[PDB]
């Protein structure tokens, strides 16, 4: 109802951030397997579609390698840090909103 609608967007953003974190962890753990393609999701489109399984698409390779692997460590690390910080921010926003909703009852 109203209570669920007030928090649906933040909850879905948190869930999508967690899923993207898992994708980044997987494609940074597979950094040595030849023939493995980097994976990630389009966060904005995914969030808009879910607010209106999970769609994922390959990443554009940076430099060629003979074995076939196409994962770039620095790019993955930057994406990991960004997603972690945004997940933390979403958690903080959700916690503050819930604290205010609780406080309004006194």
């Amino acid at each position: 109802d109203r209570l669920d609608a007030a928090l649906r967007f933040q909850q879905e953003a948190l869930n999508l951030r967690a899923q993207r974190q898992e994708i980044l962890a997987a494609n940074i753990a597979n950094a040595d397997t030849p023939g493995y393609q980097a994976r990630d999701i389009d966060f904005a489109s995914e969030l808009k579609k879910v607010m209106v399984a999970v769609d994922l698409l390959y990443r554009v390779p940076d430099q060629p390698s003979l074995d076939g692997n196409t994962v770039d460590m620095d790019r993955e690390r930057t994406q990991f840090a960004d997603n972690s910080l945004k997940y933390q921010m979403g958690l903080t926003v959700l916690g503050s909103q819930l604290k205010g909703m609780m406080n309004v009852l006194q």
Binding site: D40, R59, V60, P61, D62, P64, S65, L66
Partner: peptide
Amino acid sequence: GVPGALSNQPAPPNEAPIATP
């Protein structure tokens, strides 16, 4: 296009021919 962006299709497999076919 620009490296690091999002694409819907995989790149073609890489190869390093020692001698041209």
